[PDB]
Amino acid sequence: IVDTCSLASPASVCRTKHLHLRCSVDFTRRTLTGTAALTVQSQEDNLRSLVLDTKDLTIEKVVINGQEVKYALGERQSYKGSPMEISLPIALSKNQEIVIEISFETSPKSSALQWLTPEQTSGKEHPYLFSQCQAIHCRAILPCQDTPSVKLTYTAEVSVPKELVALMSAIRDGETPDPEDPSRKIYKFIQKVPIPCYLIALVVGALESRQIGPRTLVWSEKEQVEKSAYEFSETESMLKIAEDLGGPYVWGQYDLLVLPPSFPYGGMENPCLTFVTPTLLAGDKSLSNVIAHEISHSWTGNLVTNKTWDHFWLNEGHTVYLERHICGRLFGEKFRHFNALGGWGELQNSVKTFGETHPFTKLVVDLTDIDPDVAYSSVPYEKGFALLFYLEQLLGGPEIFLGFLKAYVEKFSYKSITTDDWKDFLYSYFKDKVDVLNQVDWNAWLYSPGLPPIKPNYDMTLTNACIALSQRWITAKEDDLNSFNATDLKDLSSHQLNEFLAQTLQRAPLPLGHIKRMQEVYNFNAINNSEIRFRWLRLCIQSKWEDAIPLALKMATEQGRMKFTRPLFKDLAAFDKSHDQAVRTYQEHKASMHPVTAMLVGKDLKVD
């Protein structure tokens, strides 16, 4: 009903139908300058003004019908920014449209953007810029109705130093020299499918591309292209599976962009151009579920969208459910269950971390006065997933539940919805299984904090060997350590190795002699897989091994994926031997970190 994260006019007052963006990237000033032309349709009679979201934007003027109009910026409301009211020259009737042209400039401190100097890049000779608009940072790039309840099409023309390449969440529509300036190029983009504004994305850097499938290029700096092509080579097979599960892929191209290491997420589902962390580059495709997840959002999230951020689980739960079905089609149902049981484990971790009563462990959250970056967690992912896996099992199994998902996607394509919309459609589709549905504790699942009231059933086949080795280490006494050997690992996949470490980490600390023996026989220090290394380093630091302190600081600072960086810094702050170092290292690095990450690691460490 009400988007408590947006200050703009709601969609019941007016709706943006289209954005035509013309902007210029200035690396010297770290500003984006340009014009945002919004086509806005009135939803009411006699509309004479409207309000847009902005954060730290400089507004030059607003033009309608070729004349400047009056506008007013209200006072800042912390993380929400400042509302911008515009006085329309003529009153609009219901469904009438006008085009509002706003000239603006971003702040170098924009919460949407990270600006990188040449030394922070792979090639060391060119700077780099990237955006991350989800959840509410589009307002820090351009003035807009910064709410997923509104969906618009967009066209953009971006001017950049001619040695650099611009990409956006859109189909590429040519490059030309900038006729106003020969040192620059203009890149053009078209997004013909309506999208919420959190899906607007921009990258500018010394990018190259390699084709990896019929509708997929990978893009990165030259140094990463080869490894990326290999690592994501499953993309087209996964797109095909996802089409079978969700119906047609409506976006045209499915390209991948591998960001610098400071990117805060594993991935970001920007339409036409999924953004991924280079920490995926394990060498063996083992972290490809991230891609399966990003691909899945082309249906769940990007086609059917949460109406407000309070209903984020809709986007994420369903996406995790489809992701695990793609991985299950490729590798088997026993693997699907393995990954699902892992997921429950992750849910346990988040709920223990927040506390059983914390409101951020509820599936549907109330984000009134809560910065969504602060609330962000695995909970909507994994409690959302568990709810759907529970429902699958209750309602007749995966094939049956997959027909509901495809139907849900068809019903709500191109729209924005609430948890109640979803639940009503669930009841409608499963009208002949209402008796079953009423056995569900909805208030607990949707609205109560803590672990779900009921645990799904999981096949244990692939997990048993992980638990068994974990238990042998946990229950080992000193006189048992000689019995461990490298051959312990011979029949474990890399996913199984990660799960053995996750199991053991849940029981951490182990004795220091146990962790040393583990290094001696398994040589976990040599593993470069990011997930495995992250869990190993946490196990080491929680077990108080001083030798791991430099390896942990290094991992925490050399990449910036929040999943890895936030807990490493937290573990390092909690180890007395590393506390001062963790703080100092944060303080030394904070100015060159991603602005969201920096804010969050500062809160975690209770510094500034």
Ligand X SMILES: O=C(CCC(=O)N1CCC[C@H]1C(=O)O)[C@@H]1CCCN1
Q: Which residues are documented as binding site for a peptide?
A: 132-134, 264-269, 561-563
Binding residues among 60-79 for Yb ion as defined by CB under 5 A: 68
Catalytic option among 101, 234, 294, 382: 294
Q: Cα–Cα distance between 138 and 19 in angstroms, integer?
A: 12
Instruction: Rank residues 31 and 305 by Cβ distance to ligand X and give the closer one.
Output: 305
Active site residue 408: no
Structure tokens at 593: 């970190």
Q: How far, in Å, CA of 247 to CA of 297, rounded?
A: 13
561 touches ligand X (CB under 6 A): yes
E-strand spans in 138-297?
151-161, 165-168, 171-178, 181-196, 202-205, 208-213, 216-220, 255-258, 267-268, 273-276
For ligand X, which residue of 157, 269, 373, 421 counts as binding (CB under 6 A)? 269
Block residue for tokens 């009903």: 1
- On whether the CB atoms of residues 322 and 246 are closer than 8 A, the answer is yes
| Contacting residue, 255, 316, 421, 499, with ligand X by CB under 6 A | 316
Binding segment (CB under 6 A) for ligand X, from list 228-236, 263-271, 471-479, 544-552: 263-271
Is residue 276 within 8 Å of residue 295, measured between CB atoms?
no
Min dist CB 31 to Zn ion, Å, is 30
Q: Looking at beta carbons only, is 53 or 531 nearer to ligand X? A: 531
Which residues contribute to the annotated binding site for Zn(2+)?
Answer: 293, 297, 316
Distance in Å, CB of 45 to Yb ion, minimum: 4
- Which run of H or E residues covers position 48? strand 47-54
Query: 424 to 453, contacts with Yb ion by CB under 5 A?
Result: 424, 427
Residues 369-398 as x/- pattern, contact with ligand X by CB under 6 A: ---------x--x-----------------
Of the pair 101, 234, the CB lying nearest ligand X is at 234
Q: In the window 28-57, what residues touch Yb ion (CB under 5 A)?
A: 45
Contacting ligand X within 127-146 (CB under 6 A)? 134
What is the spatial distance between Cα 603 and Cα 329, in angstroms, rounded to a whole number? Answer: 41
Is the dihedral angle over the CA atoms 11, 13, 17, 19 positive or is it negative? negative
Q: Compare residues 221 and 316 and give the one whose CB is closer to ligand X.
A: 316
Annotated binding site: 132-134, 264-269, 293, 297, 316, 561-563
- Backbone torsions φ then ψ of 238, nearest 5 degrees: -70, -35
381 is catalytic: yes
461 secondary structure, DSSP code: T
CA distance 165 to 187: 8
Q: Which of 399, 435, 479, 576 binds Yb ion (CB under 5 A)?
A: 479
Q: What are phi and psi of 57, to 5 degrees?
A: -95, 145
- How many residues touch Yb ion (CB under 5 A)? 6
Dist CA 111 CA 131 (whole Å) = 9
Please choose, out of 23-31, 417-425, 441-449, 450-458, the segment that lies near Yb ion by the rule CB under 5 A: 417-425
- Of the pair 25, 598, the CB lying nearest ligand X is at 598
Give the count of residues interacting with ligand X (CB under 6 A). 11
Q: Which of 148, 267, 328, 595 binds ligand X (CB under 6 A)?
A: 267
Cα–Cα distance between 534 and 536 in angstroms, integer? Answer: 6
Largest CA distance in the chain: 86
Query: By C-beta, is 302 or 543 nearer to ligand X?
Result: 302
Q: In 3-state terms, what secondary structure has residue 320?
A: helix
Contacts of 177 (CB under 8 A, 6+ apart): 162, 184, 185, 186
d(CA 608, CA 596): 14
Of residues 321, 376, 381, 390, which has the active-site annotation?
Answer: 381
Active site residues: 294, 381
Per CB under 5 A, residues contacting Zn ion are 316, 319
Per CB under 6 A, residues contacting ligand X are 134, 265-269, 316, 378, 381, 561, 563
Per CB under 5 A, residues contacting Yb ion are 45, 68, 424, 427, 477, 479
